[PDB]
Amino acid sequence: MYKILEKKEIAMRNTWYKVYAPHVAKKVQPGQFVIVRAFPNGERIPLTPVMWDREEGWIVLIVFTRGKTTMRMAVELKEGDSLLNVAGPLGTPVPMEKFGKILAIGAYTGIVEVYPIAKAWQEIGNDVTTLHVTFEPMVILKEELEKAVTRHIVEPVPLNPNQDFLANKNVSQRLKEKVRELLESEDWDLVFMVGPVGDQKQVFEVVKEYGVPMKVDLHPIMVDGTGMCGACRVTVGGEVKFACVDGPEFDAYQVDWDELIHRVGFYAKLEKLALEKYMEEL
Amino acid sequence: IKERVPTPERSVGERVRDFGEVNLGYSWELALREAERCLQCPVEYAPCIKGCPVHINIPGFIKALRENRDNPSKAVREALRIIWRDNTLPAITGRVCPQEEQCEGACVVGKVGDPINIGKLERFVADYAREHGIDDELLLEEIKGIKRNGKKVAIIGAGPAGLTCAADLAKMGYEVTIYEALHQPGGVLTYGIPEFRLPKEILRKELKKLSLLGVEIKTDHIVGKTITIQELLQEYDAVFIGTGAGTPKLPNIPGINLNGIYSANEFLTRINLMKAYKFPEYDTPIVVGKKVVVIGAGNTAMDAARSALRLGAEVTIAYRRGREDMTARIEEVKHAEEEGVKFMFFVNPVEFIGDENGNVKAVKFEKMKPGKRKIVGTGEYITVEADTVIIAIGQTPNKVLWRATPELKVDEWGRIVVDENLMTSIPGVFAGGDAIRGEATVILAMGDGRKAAKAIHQYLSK
Ligand SMILES: Cc1cc2nc3c(=O)[nH]c(=O)nc-3n(C[C@H](O)[C@H](O)[C@H](O)COP(=O)(O)OP(=O)(O)OC[C@H]3O[C@@H](n4cnc5c(N)ncnc54)[C@H](O)[C@@H]3O)c2cc1C
Ligand SMILES: Cc1cc2nc3c(=O)[nH]c(=O)nc-3n(C[C@H](O)[C@H](O)[C@H](O)COP(=O)(O)OP(=O)(O)OC[C@H]3O[C@@H](n4cnc5c(N)ncnc54)[C@H](O)[C@@H]3O)c2cc1C
Ligand code: SF4
Ligand code: SF4
Ligand code: FES
Ligand SMILES: [Mg+2]
């Protein structure tokens, strides 16, 4: 249904897709996302339109090669193939308000979701400073995100004799926590963050020690993306809210961090099973 | 005794290992035997007709079979033409209607004996017609005498209300377009009701009729986001809202967000629409524990509990009221009991207990004691262990769905207010099914879709 007009590897485990979807492109707003199904027996996954042309009818999606659905898209999809289903726009658009001096953070491929938001904030007259913390081969959208007040790229090393996370570089979260003290050197009116839930908690614990308001792009599991299943539910201000309807963005001071943290890898076992079986493409 | 003819069914042993249809239904032979039990009550005051929400000529289709015992294909074509005058989903309604509170509940033979099995006789007519290609002959007969009228109609939602509205307008010569939020049409027929109750062949055949009638289905289109009602009004002569009531009611009590706690809508969407039980041949995962507790006792809870046991789990149903208070189909309550679902009555969750890893481990209930009065709690409690909790305490319309069109009148519960001809506060815009009634029945959605197609036609004639 939706033609892959462009497909390229813009970095390590990062693919750029320019999809023809005139329905989404004519109506999408910063903070809004899409639900995609790329295969007949495939699942529905949430992705964010990074850029759009309303006239030409296309959206840009940058998918991080994470598992079965994202890897099968990277390997088996080609410029000229079509995505089966692209549903959207979805979610509540980010408020386009005069906040002032904003620090918009993106951990890993999270900067892809910071880009549409940060750009519109800057255009409406906000003094936006973007920050991208990721592995050195994963640096993406440097030139583009360079159209604001000022950009910083803090890039940890993916050490080969080091495993994936703890005690020390998926603990690239240590430096993101360290550089977050951009507070104490500058005055901020708003902190915004797209990153893994545990990383959002650690950063919020730092920003909280100061009185700076904070917004977070929350990533719970999603199925429909239309408010009819409650998989994406989050306790916001003590109330049960649905991130596909009310979010993805929520006030970081209203979120139950401990709850969302436990809800991170509930499907992990099945997720590694799904990848393992597909990887057997010999 | 002159009791009602029974229907064959697969054994518990075989059916619990798969998702295949449990009740095998009537044969031509058994259908005639059950048809000859009907007393042929006069068409104007026959209580069964009155009891059917859309008033199908029940003795009329029964007598049609009885007079053509000679040729079954003749009898079914005749019985079907009569059913199709008032109902266009007889294979779904005959299987899922709560007859006990409707047609069969009104049947005179029920007062002294068993009432006539109207649902299985209507189902037989439909299934025989579908299998022997009788419905195909009639549909092609309709399509030949169909002339376009230059006029376009948009339909919001592809459930039974929207599917029925589109079919009837196409028959009237309209250029119909359905806007559907999900990747597949059907609504609850595609994500809610399972295969063991409703074989997917009925839905697949219904979408073939609409593809033959020329109706176009626009999937991945969320009205209110993708496009608005105002925008639709600028392109279409008329609109019909059939968006249902799919938002799940979730209690805001301690533990609602522990791992293992699903809403029934999610749990059934993953099975019905996503085929997660076939993981990894299908990519959508599903986690089912050793012990499942289902909260509620409606059809949704029966479907969820019965689906969970087919995944090897031991299931328990926990209900707020008693055995007689259950809203699920009495036939499906029987099926869940034979299949091995345990029933716990007069219990109300007050907390979902979990471990330090945030997984559900137990459910804590308040013992309740026995219409707009409701019940009350005894102050006494009971705790049961659970690895998976499925919430099925109802669904509601998306109370914030209509905020993109404020000129559309909506009430306190999220239901679209309509006039006697099902027209909304906006002329040119009609609405039916769960969007106006809240959570209701397939027959009530079918009928509203049928009624609104007559009103759209009349409103588009002057
Ligand atoms: C609102 C939102 C916007 C997003 N935008 C982007 C984007 O612009 N670019 C991008 O690369 N990624 C984005 N993601 C993440 C992306 O949806 C998931 O990484 C992807 O669906 C996982 O598919 P997979 O099978 O390849 O990985 P899996 O093996 O399924 O899981 C990988 C990880 O992703 C998470 N995940 C799995 N399934 C889902 C799901 N259906 N919804 C959300 N998270 C899931 C799990 O926590 C898991 O740890 C977004 C997620 C959300 C919720
Ligand atoms: C688990 C379960 C069991 C049931 N069992 C029975 C039973 O035994 N007997 C019985 O009579 N009835 C039963 N029902 C009810 C029946 O299935 C119908 O859902 C109901 O009677 C009327 O639904 P509807 O077609 O009016 O709306 P729905 O069936 O909810 O149709 C809504 C459809 O429109 C689409 N949509 C919704 N909102 C939007 C939007 N904003 N924009 C675009 N598209 C949208 C969705 O994709 C959805 O599929 C059951 C329902 C459920 C969920
Ligand atoms: S009421 Fe019972 S008997 Fe009288 S017609 Fe309807 S079914 Fe036949
Ligand atoms: S539709 Fe429901 S009620 Fe009307 S006859 Fe068929 S079953 Fe009985
Ligand atoms: S994705 Fe299922 S309701 Fe938000
Ligand atoms: Mg996956």
Q: What is the DSSP string of B84-126?
A: HHH-S-HHHHHHHS-GGGSHHHH-GGGTTSPPP-HHHHHHHHH
The number of distinct structural domains making up chain B is: 3
Beta bridge partners of A172: none
Pick the last residue of a domain from B377, B397, B417: B397
- Substitution site in B39, B40, B102, B104 for ligand 3 pocket (most atoms within 8 Å of beta carbon): B39
Task: Kindly state whether residues B258 and B390 are assigned to the same domain.
Answer: yes
Task: Kindly state whether residues A85 and A101 are assigned to the same domain.
Answer: no
A33 burial via Cβ count (<10 Å: 0-12, 13-18, 19+): buried
Core vs surface per residue A121-146: b (16+ CB within 10 A) or e: bbeeebebbbbbbbbeebbbbeeebe
Task: Kindly state whether residues B260 and B372 are assigned to the same domain.
Answer: yes
CA distance A126 to chain B (A): 27
DSSP 8-state assignment for residue A71: H
Please state, in angstroms and as integers, the Cα–Cα distance from residue B85 to each residue in B81, B88, B176, B207, following that order.
Answer: 6, 8, 21, 19
**Degrees (nearest 5) of the Cα angle B397, B401, B403?**
135
Rounded to an integer, what distance in angstroms lies between the CA atom of residue A127 and that of residue A119?
Answer: 10
Interface check for B281 against chain A (CB to CB < 8 A): the answer is yes
Atom of ligand 2 nearest to the CA of B224: 41
Give me the residue label for tokens 């033959």.
Answer: B212
Core vs surface per residue A39-59: b (16+ CB within 10 A) or e: beebbbbbbbbbbbeeeebbb
Pick the last residue of a domain from A52, A79, A96: A96
Pick the last residue of a domain from A68, A96, A124: A96
Interface check for A271 against chain B (CB to CB < 8 A): the answer is yes
Atom of ligand 4 nearest to the CA of B54: 4
Please state, in angstroms and as integers, the Cα–Cα distance from residue B143 to each residue in B135, B140, B152, B237, following that order.
Answer: 12, 5, 18, 22
- CA distance between the termini of chain A: 29
Pick the last residue of a domain from B87, B110, B140: B140
Task: Kindly state whether residues A260 and A135 are assigned to the same domain.
Answer: yes
Task: Kindly state whether residues A235 and A105 are assigned to the same domain.
Answer: yes
Q: What is the DSSP string of A203-238?
A: HHHHHHTTT--EEEE-----SSSSSSS-TTEEEETT
Task: Kindly state whether residues B60 and B14 are assigned to the same domain.
Answer: yes
Task: Kindly state whether residues A144 and A208 are assigned to the same domain.
Answer: yes
Interface check for B361 against chain A (CB to CB < 8 A): the answer is no
Task: Kindly state whether residues A242 and A102 are assigned to the same domain.
Answer: yes
Neighbours of B219 (CB within 10 A): 17
Task: Kindly state whether residues B136 and B146 are assigned to the same domain.
Answer: no
* Max intra-chain CA distance, chain A: 55
Task: Kindly state whether residues A140 and A249 are assigned to the same domain.
Answer: yes
* Domain around B335: 246-397
What's the token pair of residue A50? 């990074």
Task: Kindly state whether residues B44 and B54 are assigned to the same domain.
Answer: yes
**Degrees (nearest 5) of the Cα angle B185, B189, B193?**
145
Rounded to an integer, what distance in angstroms lies between the CA atom of residue A214 and that of residue A126?
Answer: 15
Task: Kindly state whether residues B132 and B152 are assigned to the same domain.
Answer: no
Ligand 3 centroid distance, CA of B59 (Å)? 6
Nearest 5°: phi and psi at B119? -60, -50
Resolution in A: 2.5
Task: Kindly state whether residues A221 and A105 are assigned to the same domain.
Answer: yes
CA atoms within 13 A on the CB side of B459: 21
Atom of ligand 3 nearest to the CA of B62: 8
Asked if residue A278 is part of any domain, the answer here is no
- The packing angle between helices B72-86 and B58-67, to 10°, is 170
- Substitution site in B48, B57, B82, B103 for ligand 4 pocket (most atoms within 8 Å of beta carbon): B103
* Pick among A260, A262, A273 to test the B interface (most B CBs inside 10 A): A262
Interface check for A259 against chain B (CB to CB < 8 A): the answer is yes
Given a contact cutoff of 8 angstroms between Cβ atoms, the answer to whether B105 and B115 are in contact is yes
Rounded to an integer, what distance in angstroms lies between the CA atom of residue A271 and that of residue A278?
Answer: 11
3-state secondary structure of B384: strand
- Chain A residue with Cα closest to B274: A43
Task: Kindly state whether residues A192 and A218 are assigned to the same domain.
Answer: yes
Asked if residue A280 is part of any domain, the answer here is no
Task: Kindly state whether residues A17 and A157 are assigned to the same domain.
Answer: no
- CA distance between the termini of chain B: 58
Asked if residue A72 is part of any domain, the answer here is yes
Interface check for B64 against chain A (CB to CB < 8 A): the answer is no
* Domain around A65: 1-96
Task: Kindly state whether residues B331 and B351 are assigned to the same domain.
Answer: yes
CB atoms within 5 A of ion ligand 6 belong to: A 69
Task: Kindly state whether residues A113 and A237 are assigned to the same domain.
Answer: yes
Given a contact cutoff of 8 angstroms between Cβ atoms, the answer to whether A3 and A19 are in contact is yes
CA distance B158 to chain A (A): 15
Asked if residue A42 is part of any domain, the answer here is yes
A160 burial via Cβ count (<10 Å: 0-12, 13-18, 19+): exposed
Asked if residue A7 is part of any domain, the answer here is yes
Rounded to an integer, what distance in angstroms lies between the CA atom of residue B341 and that of residue B448?
Answer: 35
A36 burial via Cβ count (<10 Å: 0-12, 13-18, 19+): buried
Give me the residue label for tokens 């090393």.
Answer: A157
Alpha helix (H) residue ranges in A21-163 = 22-25, 68-76, 111-123
**Degrees (nearest 5) of the Cα angle B19, B275, B215?**
100
Task: Kindly state whether residues B122 and B158 are assigned to the same domain.
Answer: no
Task: Kindly state whether residues B393 and B378 are assigned to the same domain.
Answer: yes
The number of distinct structural domains making up chain A is: 2
For B204-255, the three-class secondary structure string (H helix, E strand, C coil) is HHHHHHHHHCCCEEEECCCECCCECHHHHHCCCCEEEECCCCCEECCCCCCC
Taking alpha carbons only, the member of B143, B99, B146, B148 closest to residue B119 is B99
Core vs surface per residue A204-221: b (16+ CB within 10 A) or e: bebbeeeebebbbbbbbb
Task: Kindly state whether residues B179 and B226 are assigned to the same domain.
Answer: yes
What is the sign of the dihedral through the CA atoms of A206, A209, A210 and A215? Answer: positive
Task: Kindly state whether residues B380 and B318 are assigned to the same domain.
Answer: yes
Task: Kindly state whether residues A108 and A210 are assigned to the same domain.
Answer: yes
Pick the last residue of a domain from A96, A114, A149: A96
Which residues does chain A have within 8 Å of residue B262's beta carbon, measured at their own beta carbons?
231
Ligand 1 centroid distance, CA of B284 (Å)? 13
Taking alpha carbons only, the member of B128, B24, B6, B4 closest to residue B72 is B128
Rg (CA), chain A: 18
Sequence-separated (6 or more) residues with CB below 8 Å from residue A157:
A135, A136, A169
B373, amino acid identity = R
DSSP 8-state assignment for residue A5: E
Rounded to an integer, what distance in angstroms lies between the CA atom of residue B242 and that of residue B223?
Answer: 11
Task: Kindly state whether residues A57 and A110 are assigned to the same domain.
Answer: no
Task: Kindly state whether residues B48 and B125 are assigned to the same domain.
Answer: yes
Beta bridge partners of B262: B390
Pick the last residue of a domain from B140, B160, B191: B140
